[PDB]
């Protein structure tokens, strides 16, 4: 199906910024936003705003753990904003003025995209397709059980040996 | 039939020698241990049974507590048996016997009212193969579940993600 950015990443936009005398924008460290997401159960490792020549672009990348708990967290992050009426599709409606953060998990569109996001997604990660991953993992598992059953199967044979002698 | 745990071997007809004082003596049996080792029988210990004459002409062969032990002991047993030197062979009133006669220790020996039985009860207890053989493959059919369980779990964890995706 659709691919995603490994390691899993979150995109949030519409961060409030402030323009200083020199004309550069600034903003919160995002560790404030990290904490919130932590308290929310989203357990991200890192929240870094994307910078440019002006400074804070009003967008940040949310970083999740490489493992399967990561992907879990990120998806939650995604479903939250989506159900709150603050998904990407919501960010993009020309339907007017937007209030508060809008956020979504990073897929191929974002990785591809010709902009400061896409540029910072390719600098840091690679596309990967869920099922492809989801498959290898249950294959890696159906694999050991054999090897275990094998080892038991063996011990069983070792036990019929003795009985056959007895 | 039951057997003596830890597994033991009985060998009889060890040659002995009578000293001036009227006591019998014999080899240490570590010589016999070594032979059995070279034979693949891998015993831990061979100790002759003594009394107040000294060497009774019989020794107990000791095997490891584990399942390799029982294996070794049984081999020991089948060897002597096929060599024409089992217990049934030791006991025929059919005449004069040459060389060691040996056999693995079962209930008869453990019970028996003699220096053997007395030294098997002092050192071990009867146990019935199947009873043991059972618990072991039950202990095993048991973990595989618990493993499959753990995998079964990870599989569910994986459908979760797919269901969200």
UniProtKB/Swiss-Prot annotation, chain A:
Disruption phenotype: Late flowering phenotype and reduction of DNA methylation at RNA-directed DNA methylation (RdDM) target loci. Keywords: Coiled coil, RNA-binding, RNA-mediated gene silencing. Interacts with FMD1/IDNL1. Forms a complex with FMD1/IDNL1 and FMD2/INDL2. Can form homodimers. Interacts with MORC6. The gene is IDN2. Transmembrane segments: none annotated. This is Protein INVOLVED IN DE NOVO 2. The chain holds residues 124 to 289 of 647 of the full protein. Forms a complex with FDM1/IDNL1 and FDM2/IDNL2 that is required for RNA-directed DNA methylation (RdDM) and that functions at a downstream step of the RdDM pathway and downstream of small interfering RNA (siRNA) formation. Required for de novo DNA methylation, siRNA accumulation and siRNA-mediated maintenance methylation. Required for several post-transcriptional gene silencing pathways. Binds double-stranded RNAs (dsRNAs) with 5'-overhangs through its XS domain. GO terms for molecular function: RNA binding. GO terms for biological process: gene silencing by siRNA-directed DNA methylation; regulation of double-strand break repair via homologous recombination; response to cadmium ion.
């Amino acid at each position: 199906d659709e691919k995603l950015v490994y390691p899993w990443k979150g995109i949030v936009v519409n961060i409030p910024t402030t323009k200083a005398q020199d004309g550069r924008s600034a903003g919160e460290s995002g560790s404030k936003l990290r904490d919130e997401y932590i308290l929310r159960g989203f357990n991200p490792t890192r929240v870094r705003p994307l910078w440019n020549y002006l400074g804070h672009s009003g967008t940040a990348i949310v970083e999740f753990n490489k493992d399967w708990n990561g992907l879990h967290n990120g998806l939650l992050f995604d479903k939250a904003y989506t159900v709150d009426g603050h998904g990407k599709k919501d960010w993009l409606k020309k339907d007017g003025p937007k209030l508060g953060l809008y956020g979504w998990i990073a897929r191929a569109d974002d990785y591809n995209g010709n902009n400061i996001i896409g540029e910072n997604l390719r600098k840091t990660g690679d596309l990967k397709t869920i099922a492809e991953l989801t498959e290898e993992e249950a294959r890696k598992q159906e694999l050991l059980v054999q090897n275990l059953r094998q080892l038991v199967e063996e011990k069983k044979k070792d036990m019929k040996e003795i009985e056959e002698l007895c």
